[PDB]
Amino acid sequence: GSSGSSGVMVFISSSLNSFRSEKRYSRSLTIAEFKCKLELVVGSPASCMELELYGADDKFYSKLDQEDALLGSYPVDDGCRIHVIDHSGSGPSSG
């Protein structure tokens, strides 16, 4: 245990995965860092994969390009959807 335990529930997705996943991340997690996480979610490189902030009825809003930004400054919230765009691809190689 340690001081610090809170974040925002977002629905992470990926063209690789059929349905969306249920993960959590602090609003202080820099976009750059945030991806570092997805790296384990999509299993792909965060330096390749892209993030997307979709509204409710899957309605893209903005892109999480800003790496020096903190997860929150954007029009997101615990319940939004984070569609991870697998830029890596993968298929024959690796797998």
Question: Which tokens hold the place of 71?
Answer: 């997860």
Report the distance separating Cα 36 and Cα 92, nearest Å: 24
Structure method: NMR
Report the residue count for the chain. Answer: 95
Per-residue exposure over 56-86, b if at least 16 CB sit within 10 Å of its own CB, e if not: eeeeeeeebeeeeeebeebebeeebbbbbbb
Task: Report the CATH fold assignment for 7-86.
Answer: Ubiquitin-like (UB roll) (3.10.20)
CA nearest 33: which of 62, 69, 61? 69
Residues 6+ apart with CB under 8 A from 71: 8, 25, 26, 27, 28, 29, 30, 31, 34, 64
Is the CB of residue 9 less than 8 Å from the CB of residue 78? yes
- The structure tokens 């490189």 sit at 45
Report the distance separating Cα 44 and Cα 61, nearest Å: 23
Any bridge partners for residue 63, and if so which? 52
